[PDB]
Amino acid sequence: LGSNSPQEEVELKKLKHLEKSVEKIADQLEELNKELTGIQQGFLPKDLQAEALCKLDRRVKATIEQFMKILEEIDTLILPENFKDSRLKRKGLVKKVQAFLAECDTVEQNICQ
Amino acid sequence: MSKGPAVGIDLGTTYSCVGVFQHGKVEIIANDQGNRTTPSYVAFTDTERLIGDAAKNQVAMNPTNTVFDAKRLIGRRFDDAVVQSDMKHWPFMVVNDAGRPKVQVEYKGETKSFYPEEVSSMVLTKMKEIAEAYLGKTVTNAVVTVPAYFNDSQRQATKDAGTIAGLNVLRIINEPTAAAIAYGLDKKVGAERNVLIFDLGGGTFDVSILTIEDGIFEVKSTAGDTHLGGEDFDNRMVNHFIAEFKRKHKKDISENKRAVRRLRTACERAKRTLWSSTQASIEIDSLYEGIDFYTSITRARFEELNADLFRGTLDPVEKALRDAKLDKSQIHDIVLVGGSTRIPKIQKLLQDFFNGKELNKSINPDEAVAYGAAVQAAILS
């Protein structure tokens, strides 16, 4: 405890950059979620709602792929037991990405049906 | 832009490579993403056509409209046994057009079909653009390589791809010949030299025996396995890890495509680490059902998992020697080509077979063919 090393600062900076990359992808997901809600609860004729939902397909697949590439980059990190702050940050980031992926899967279940 | 030099291009089944001879040496050219090899991939989307890394990067999002392995189809008839066997494993459609194969895709909302030489011409166009971006000069002249076993139709279709791409194809030379040229094997003083080319890279395994006499190259024999490579070695590792996760947690991660992909990507990276290190570590948080997977693999374990595959690479070497009517003791030079030849066990098995003989391996194996083609291009310019 209280043995913080300069070396861990390098891993924490790598994780912060990954956190920023996740925030950018999460902003794309937020727009997709708002558009999906807008179609489901909006005033488009029931005959045109299928086409509007179907148009989100390319973007949701691109968002899923971006999150998968972040997971692959996080998976390159090797953190010793002593780097407790980095291990907590890594775990928190993976769970955040996995939660986002589950939201992407919900979008996929609601389009092109 | 002013006129540039002639280039050497290795048009591979999965990756392609371009080199240029200048300032007395070969420079292998990095693409726009900084990679010294470029995926031989072309993707068709709702709005554009993507080539190389950009096409490989979106394969998971658009599998049916992302073409690769065009080299397996070029110059072949639709009914060729190779075409029919290969078609079963591709996510894109292959159709028959009056006896000739065509790839069929959705492009900008319309159904389109392309001949294999058209697909290869798009890959060649990217390689030409890669050379121009680096040189800051226009590139028109090139030497393109082909496998030694390619027939007249396969050789002609490759030339056609070059012409379509707007390249002036100076010459078409065999891949094992290009590798021998890179090492200056034709330049060694004395009588005829027998050369064995061991090419394990890009999803194919090719063994070739060449005899060089007064600078003339003659192919004596060819042997190999059309579908063998790094993916097979990586797979053995994946099976090992899936079994380890079952033993440790009593959970099967095999049906979760994302968990298998995270594991496969980590295995590919660990395999590369094992080229120069004796152990590799893997840490994957929340791999499956929130379980963290922290493990490691030694180079010895990697070798054991792949023992039958590695040993099996010597059967083609024996078959090529038999077909060339030569004793192993009669082989003057051994050349390593392709990324999998970086595996120390493969090098050891081959050096032991040839009773301690040193291997020609100083040139990056992935680049050796482009290197030789770049030397040939400089000679013809």
| Domains of chain B from N-terminus onward | 1-67+123-187+361-381 (3.30.420.40), 68-122 (3.30.30.30), 188-228+313-360 (3.30.420.40), 229-312 (3.90.640.10)
In degrees, to the nearest 5, what angle opens at C-alpha B295 toward C-alphas B289 and B296? 155
Q: Which amino acid is at B59?
A: V
Question: Token pair of B269, please?
Answer: 């990276």
Size of the A and B interface in Cβ pairs below 8 Å? 40
Grouping H, G, I as helix, E, B as strand and the rest as coil, residue B61 is coil
Chain-centre distance for alpha carbon B105:
24
Of A62, A78, A98, the CB nearest to B283: A78
Is the Cβ of A68 closer than 8 Å to some Cβ of chain B? yes
Domain count, chain A: 1
Cα separation of A32 and A53, whole Å?
10
Bridge partners for B18 per DSSP: B9
> B85 with B63: CB under 8 angstroms?
no
Q: Which amino acid is at B69?
A: D
**Among this protein's residues, is B199 annotated catalytic?**
yes
- Technique used to solve these coordinates: X-ray
Beta strand spans in B23-149 (E): 25-28, 38-39, 42-44, 49-51, 66-67, 93-97, 100-107, 110-114, 141-146
Of A58, A65, A95, the CB nearest to B60: A65
Question: How would you classify the pairing of strands B93-97 and B66-67?
Answer: unpaired
Helix (H) or strand (E) holding B163: helix B152-164
> B66 with B92: CB under 8 angstroms?
yes
Cα separation of A29 and A15, whole Å?
21
In degrees, to the nearest 5, what angle opens at C-alpha B11 toward C-alphas B4 and B374? 40
Is the Cβ of B286 closer than 8 Å to some Cβ of chain A? yes
CATH code, domain with A35: 1.20.58.120
Cα separation of B47 and B228, whole Å?
35
Q: Is B156 exposed, middle or buried (0-12, 13-18, 19+ CB in 10 A)?
A: middle
- Helix, strand, coil percentages for chain A (3-state, nearest 5): 80, 0, 20
CA dihedral B75, B79, B85, B91 (to 10 degrees): 70
Cα separation of B135 and B117, whole Å?
26
Cα separation of B248 and B240, whole Å?
12
Grouping H, G, I as helix, E, B as strand and the rest as coil, residue B76 is coil
Cα separation of B327 and B292, whole Å?
53
- Counting DSSP H helices and E strands in chain A, the numbers are 4, 0
Cα separation of B80 and B100, whole Å?
10
Cα separation of B210 and B198, whole Å?
11
Which residues, other chains included, contact B164 with Cβ-Cβ below 8 Å and sequence gap of 6+?
Answer: B117, B118, B121, B124
* Chain-chain contact of B61 with A62 (C-beta, under 8 angstroms): yes
Question: Token pair of B79, please?
Answer: 């009914």
Cα separation of B72 and B70, whole Å?
5
Q: How far is B230 from chain A (nearest CA, A)?
A: 19
Chain-centre distance for alpha carbon B264:
19
> B183 with B359: CB under 8 angstroms?
no
CA dihedral B21, B41, B12, B230 (to 10 degrees): 120
CA dihedral A84, A90, A94, A96 (to 10 degrees): 90
A98 lies in which domain range? 1-113
Of B381, B376, B378, B369, nearest to B146 (Cα)? B369
Cα separation of B320 and B207, whole Å?
7
* Chain-chain contact of B286 with A79 (C-beta, under 8 angstroms): no
